[PDB]
């Protein structure tokens, strides 16, 4: 690819972290533009997306400073479509595996996350609801993993999709962040340290060791400081 | 492609209708198996449906081969057909256009899909449904389909919008008689003229016609669903 790529996200957004992982995995030449979550979003940002939706990608157009988005560039939103987008722009990076079947399983794995775990990370960590279903969806996602490696063997958009969220969960859990009760937090730290969740615990360590994740995570400290401002 | 394709669905499933539309658009040679029989756990141990078996020997659908690949999750099944039949251009060619087709599905999934269910199956307040319908409508071009030519966007959303119109026209659903009145008038009003044509253009699409039973069959099916009363 020769078109310019710019990724817009609010700071340490896991949805934007998805697209960040994929651009790193893709070897892409891209600009990164973060926006301070707690500020209002600059006036210029409506030229990226009139509704203030984030994350977003601009693609093509002249090279421009991100805070001066060109009207010429194509603007794109929806984090999982942005992952698929990077894969299409950089087919040579094999962000998905090659065969249709393996690609279907990578996407299925994301769907397991979306349909079962994604909502319970917000019920349990932001709405303080009973944690049982969270742990059960975590088990459900865990069961779709192969015994080693990543969701379809080699790293894929599945990981781009799920890594930002699983990585924050452990970080939050280790830190006791969340709206859950002290009882449910003990109960979640205990489940995650048990053999029941060894596979998922291994899946997260291996995610965090991936270079594309490390670069786009920044370190646990900053994400912790970020988390404690929500 | 030469591998065998078998699509498993329940008879009037919109999720299976998704995969059915896409296989028709693709020109695929495939078996269709509508239905839960004991044998189905060989397709998918969790009884998940729709499902596709892919490859292996030719077999009758109720005797799935241990060799065939089993795949589930309707939207991965859509993308799957597209990956197997790139020549059918089930998505457009450029990355930007493919991203907008996928963004359009996300608009349906994230804003309208759940509200369709609150209004028509949980008899919940209808206001939010109409706003998401407008929101999906706003992501359409003034003519044509979601990204111009027919795409997985249509395979993905057609089964649900086509069922919405049919239920509303039929007064099926758990909404109040008042909220049903409010929606029939809204869908016939200028506010929702673009989306009503969308459904019309969809319903004329050959792949839809074939994978739609006919309004008759879908109605007979619809009137045997409890959550519509
Ligand atoms: O199937 C899904 C999906 C399912 C449920 C919720 C959200 C997404 C899917 C997810 C990622 C992707 O790249 C392609 C896909 O089809
Ligand atoms: O982006 C999405 C998506 C987003 C939210 C919910 C469900 C899906 C998407 C939808 C279809 C698809 O084939 C690939 C995709 O990434
Ligand atoms: Mg809940």
Author numbering:
A (entry chain B): 3 to 232
B (entry chain A): 3 to 37, 43 to 236
Paper excerpt:
To further explore this issue, we have conducted biochemical and crystallographic studies on the interactions of six GSTOs from T. versicolor with chemical libraries. The six TvGSTOs (named TvGSTO1S to TvGSTO6S) used in this study are representatives of the twelve TvGSTOs that have a catalytic serine, while four others have a cysteine instead. In this study, we demonstrated at the biochemical and structural level that T. versicolor GSTs that belong to the Omega class interact with polyphenolic compounds found in wood, and in particular with flavonoids such as dihydrowogonin and naringenin. The ability of TvGSTOs to bind polyphenols through different sites suggests that fungal GSTs could be involved in the transport of various polyphenols.
Indeed, a few compounds significantly increased the stability of TvGSTO1S, 3S and 6S, i.e. they show a variation of the denaturation temperature ∆Td > 5 °C. On the contrary, most chemical compounds induced a destabilizing effect on TvGSTO5S and 2S (∆Td < 0 °C), whereas the chemical library had little impact on TvGSTO4S thermal stability. As shown with TSA, other TvGSTO isoforms also interact with HBPs, each with its own selectivity. The alignment of the solved structures with the sequences of TvGSTO1S, −2S, −4S and −5S shows variations at the putative H- and L-sites, which could explain the isoform-specific TSA patterns.
